[PDB]
Short mmCIF file of C-alpha atoms in Angstrom, two decimals:
data_model
loop_
_atom_site.label_atom_id
_atom_site.label_comp_id
_atom_site.label_asym_id
_atom_site.label_seq_id
_atom_site.Cartn_x
_atom_site.Cartn_y
_atom_site.Cartn_z
CA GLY Z 1 0.00 0.00 0.00
CA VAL Z 2 0.78 3.71 0.60
CA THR Z 3 2.45 5.25 3.68
CA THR Z 4 0.86 8.39 5.10
CA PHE Z 5 1.39 10.66 8.08
CA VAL Z 6 -0.98 12.81 10.12
CA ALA Z 7 -0.33 16.42 11.08
CA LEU Z 8 -0.11 16.88 14.86
CA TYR Z 9 -0.24 20.69 14.76
CA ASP Z 10 -1.27 23.54 12.51
CA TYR Z 11 1.47 25.13 10.39
CA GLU Z 12 1.19 28.32 8.34
CA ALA Z 13 3.90 28.47 5.68
CA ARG Z 14 6.89 30.66 6.56
CA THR Z 15 8.49 30.43 3.10
CA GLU Z 16 7.10 30.49 -0.43
CA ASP Z 17 7.86 26.77 -0.86
CA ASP Z 18 6.45 25.63 2.49
CA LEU Z 19 3.10 23.85 2.75
CA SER Z 20 0.43 25.22 5.08
CA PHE Z 21 -1.62 22.53 6.78
CA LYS Z 22 -3.90 22.04 9.73
CA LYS Z 23 -3.78 19.51 12.49
CA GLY Z 24 -5.27 16.21 11.32
CA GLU Z 25 -4.44 16.49 7.61
CA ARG Z 26 -3.09 13.39 5.88
CA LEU Z 27 0.29 13.89 4.26
CA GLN Z 28 2.47 11.87 1.94
CA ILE Z 29 6.22 12.43 1.99
CA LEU Z 30 7.82 12.98 -1.41
CA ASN Z 31 11.41 13.53 -0.28
CA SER Z 32 13.12 13.65 3.12
CA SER Z 33 16.79 13.91 2.13
CA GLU Z 34 17.38 17.62 2.97
CA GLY Z 35 17.15 17.57 6.75
CA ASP Z 36 14.28 18.10 9.14
CA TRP Z 37 12.08 19.84 6.53
CA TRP Z 38 10.45 17.22 4.28
CA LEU Z 39 8.78 17.78 0.91
CA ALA Z 40 5.19 16.64 1.31
CA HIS Z 41 1.84 16.49 -0.46
CA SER Z 42 -1.44 16.94 1.39
CA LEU Z 43 -3.94 14.23 0.49
CA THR Z 44 -6.51 16.39 2.26
CA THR Z 45 -6.08 19.69 0.34
CA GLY Z 46 -4.01 18.73 -2.72
CA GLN Z 47 -1.31 21.27 -1.90
CA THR Z 48 2.42 20.52 -1.87
CA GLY Z 49 5.49 21.94 -0.16
CA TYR Z 50 8.01 21.67 2.63
CA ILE Z 51 6.86 20.77 6.13
CA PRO Z 52 8.60 20.63 9.50
CA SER Z 53 8.93 16.91 10.10
CA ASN Z 54 8.40 17.22 13.85
CA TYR Z 55 4.83 18.30 13.03
CA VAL Z 56 3.76 14.82 11.86
CA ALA Z 57 3.05 11.40 13.31
CA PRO Z 58 2.74 8.04 11.60
CA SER Z 59 -0.66 6.85 10.59
#
């Protein structure tokens, strides 16, 4: 199947490339190779961007 994560907290983007999301959104991780900001896609909203990885939990 598909691995997803759940947002634990709200985040409002602090850069142009960051993804804004609310607590409880379902996220898929596209790339995690650049440190503690991961490139993610929201399955909930369809938006894409960097997220702080400490804001998510495993499904």
